[PDB]
Symmetry: D2
Subunit: 248 residues, 4 copies
Amino acid sequence: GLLQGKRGLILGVANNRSIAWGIAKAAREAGAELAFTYQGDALKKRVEPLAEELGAFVAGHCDVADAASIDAVFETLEKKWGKLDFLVHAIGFSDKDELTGRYIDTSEANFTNTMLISVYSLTAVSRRAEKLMADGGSILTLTYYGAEKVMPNYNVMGVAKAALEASVKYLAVDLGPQNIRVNAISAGPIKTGDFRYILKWNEYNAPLRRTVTIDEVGDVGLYFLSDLSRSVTGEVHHADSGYHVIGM
Amino acid sequence: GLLQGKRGLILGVANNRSIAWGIAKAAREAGAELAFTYQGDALKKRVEPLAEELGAFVAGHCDVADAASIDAVFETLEKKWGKLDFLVHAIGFSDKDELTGRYIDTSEANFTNTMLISVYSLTAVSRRAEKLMADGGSILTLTYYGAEKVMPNYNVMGVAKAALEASVKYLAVDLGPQNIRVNAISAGPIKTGDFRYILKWNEYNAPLRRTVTIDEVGDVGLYFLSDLSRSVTGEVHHADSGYHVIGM
Amino acid sequence: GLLQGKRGLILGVANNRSIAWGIAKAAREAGAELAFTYQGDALKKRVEPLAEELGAFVAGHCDVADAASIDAVFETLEKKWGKLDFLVHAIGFSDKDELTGRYIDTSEANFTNTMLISVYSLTAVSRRAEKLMADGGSILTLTYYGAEKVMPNYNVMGVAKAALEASVKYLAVDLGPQNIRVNAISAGPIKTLAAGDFRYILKWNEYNAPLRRTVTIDEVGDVGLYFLSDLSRSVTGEVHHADSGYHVIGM
Amino acid sequence: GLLQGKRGLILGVANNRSIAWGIAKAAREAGAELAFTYQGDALKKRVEPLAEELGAFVAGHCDVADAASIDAVFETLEKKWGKLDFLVHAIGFSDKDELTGRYIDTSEANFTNTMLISVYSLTAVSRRAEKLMADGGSILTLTYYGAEKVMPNYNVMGVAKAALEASVKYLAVDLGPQNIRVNAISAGPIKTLAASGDFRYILKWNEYNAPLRRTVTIDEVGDVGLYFLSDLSRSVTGEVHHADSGYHVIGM
C-alpha cells in the first residue's frame, strides 16, 4: 500500500462529494491513517461519520481565520502521533455573489477574506506542519486553471489561486531542504452560479471529453502524497481531462 | 508626442529615482498632462517639486487602504479634467523585516497589508479609473520576476505579485470592451536587504549584461500608455534585460 | 521618427496585407531605411513595387533553405550599408492541406520543411545578421498563440512556433552581450480582404478577446515599431501578445 | 500491481542507467509486460539482456527516421499482443559537439535531425500506437527545463524539447477522445556512474539550488513514469510534469 505507515491531516472535508474526500478515501485505501478537522460545530455532525467511514481521527475544530484553532489542531496531532507525514490543504472561500459579478467590482473585505482563507491558510498550516514533519513529507493544496487564465464566475478567486500557486513555489523552497514537498493539483470542474455551462464546456472541449471526478482527483492526490512523487515539488499539476492545453 | 493630448494619473511617485518617475518623465516628454497623488504630509513636501518639474497637477493625498481617499482623488480629477486616458499604478509595500527571512514565517498582518496595498489597490483605483475612462485608455502596473519564480529576499511580495499579474488578466477582460487596456511591466532590479548581489547577478547573467534603468523602463511604460500598444492588453511584459529567459 | 538613422532587413514581405508589410510600413513612417528580400521569380514581380512604395532596397533572392542565398543577401547588405540596425523575420510555411487534418497525421516532409522554414531560418539569418550588428540591434520574429495552447487549423505550425519562441530565448542569450535584442510578437489572427475555417477563428477572437476585435497589421506594425525602436532596449527574449488580449482567455 | 494486466512499449532502452530503464524497471515491478525496441546504433545483443532482465519481448529494431521501421515494430506488437496499453518515448538526439557551441551556430543538418529524431518521432510513433490503443492508454515522453528556459549545453535540444512539449499538447487533443493520454516528464539532470561537457557543474548547481537539495535519480523518475502509465493519472493529459527536485521554480 502506497501510504502504508503514513499519517496525514486533511483540512476541508465537509461532505462525501468533495475533492478533499476523494483524496482522503484514496489515501486511506493506500493505507494512510488520517486526521480530519471540521469547520464549526454545524459541520462536526456531518464530519464525524465521514471520519468513522475512513477510520479518521477527528483532530478538532479548525477555522483557518483563527490562529488559535490551528495551533490546537496541531497540539492534538503532536500528542497523538508526534509526527505528520502529509498534509492536504483543501480550504477555499470566496464571496458567492461577487463571483457572478465583474472582477473589477470586487469589494475589499471579500478580497482580503478570500486571500486570507484561500491563500494564507496554507502558509499558516504549513508553518506548523513543519514542526511535525522533520523526517520529511508532502503538503498538497488545490487550485484551478482560473489562476492562469480568465475563467468565468471565478473573479477574485482567480487572483487568490494565482497567489496560492506562487506561495506553493516559495513554500517548496523553504521546506524542500527538510525533504518536505509542496504541490498543488489544478482540478477541472467536477459534477456536483452558472456551473452547468462550465461543466458542459469541459465535457465537449477537454481532450478526454469528460469532466473529472473526485476519484480521479483523489488518485492524483494519492500520487502527490505517496513516494512516487518523491522528486516533485513546487508543482501545479493539472487533473482536468487535459483542459488547460485548449486555447480555443 | 506619442502621448500628446492625453492626461494620466501616476500613483507612487515619492522621489526622482523610481520607475514611476521614469515613466512620468518619459510620459511628460511625450506630451502627456500628468497628475500625481502623494501619501502623507512627509511625502507632500517631496512630491510638490517633482510635480513642478513635469507640470504635474497634484491631485491630493491617496492611501489605498483608505477608500475615501481614492474617491477624493478621482472626484478631484473628474473636476479638473473630466477624463483620464491612462493610469500608472506604481504602489507596493511589504514589511521590510519579513522579506529577509523565510516566506513560511510571513505574518498574517504583513500578508494582508501587502495584498491590500500591492494588489487590491490596482483593482480599487481601476474601478474608479473606469468612470473617467469610458471612451478608452491604458492602465499600467509594475511587477517582478518573483511573481513567476522564487527570487531571494522577496517572499510574500512574490505571492502578491502573482496575484497582481493574475488581477491584470481579470481587469483586462472587465475593461477591454470599453477599450481600456490593462498591462504590467515586469521590471528587473534597478540601481538606486541584500540588493547588491541581486543587481550583480542580473548584471552578469542577464542576456544584455546590464541591470535596467528607470529611463529604460519609463520608455517601456511610454509604449504601454501610447497607442503603439493598443492591441495589447492583459500582458506581463519583461523589461529586465532578458533576465527572465535564464534557467541557470 | 523613432527609427530615424536606422537600417533594417525585412524578410517575408510578399504582399501589402501581411504583418511584415505592416511592420515595414510603420518602420518606414518612423524614418527607417528598409531592405526587402524575395523568394520566387514570381515574388520578385510582387516585392519590387512594394519596395518602391517604401523606398526599400531589394536585397535579392533568399531561399531560406539555400544557405548560399542567405550569405549572398547579407553580403549585398554589407557592401551597401556596412551595418544593420534591425531585422524582421516574418518567414514561415507549413502544408496548407495538413493544417486542416489532425496534427497526429502530420507528414515527416511537412514537419521537417515547416521546422526548417519557420524556425531554423531565424537562426540561420540571425547568424549572418550578427556580423553586421556589432554596434547592437534588434531582431524581431512573429509567432501565434497556437505555440502555447492547442489552436484549430494550426497543427504542426504550433509545434514549430513553440520551437521558434524557444529559439528566440536561446538566440537572446547568444546575442545580448553584443547588445542585440531578439524578440517575437505573438500576433492574433488578422482579417484579410483577399481570397479552412479561418473566418470562424476570427469571429471567436472578435467576440472573446477582451478588446472585442481582431488586431490589424497597422496595430501589429506599431508593436513591431516598438521592438525595432530604442523604447524596447531593455526587452529581449520576450514573446509579446499583440492579440487584443485573447491570450488571457481561458474559456 | 499498478500496471497489472498492462502491456506497453518502451522505446530508447540502450543501457541500465537511463530514465527509459528506470521507467521500464518501475513498470515491470508494477506488473507490466514490456516490449523493447533497439534504437539506431543499439545492438540487438545489447538490448536483449536488458529485455530479459524484465522478461521484455524485443519488438525489433526501430529507426525513427524510417517510417517503415516504425510500422514493422507496431505490426510485430499487433501480431503478438493485438492491443497496447502504453508507450514510453525516450528517444532524443542532437549532435554532441554543437551542444558545447553557441545555439546560433547550430548547423541546418543538426537542427533537422534533432527535430526529426527528438520531436517528430513521438508524433510518428503515437500515430501507429493509436491504432493499438482503441480502448485507450498512456503515451509518455521525456523533456527538460531547457525547453522553457535557456539552460547550458543544450542549445538546439532546448528548441527541440520546446517543440516536443507543444506536440504533447496537440497529440493530447487528437488522442484524448479515444481515451489516450499523452504526457511529458520534465526530468532534472541525473548523476551517472558511467564515463564522463560541463555536466558536473549542472548537477552540482541543481544539487545546491533545487528546493530538495539533490539531483533526481532514474528510480525517482521511473516512479513518476509509473504514475503516468498507471490509471492514477487518468485525469491527466497534455501535461509537462517536473520530476526535478523542484528546480523549475527557482528564479535565481
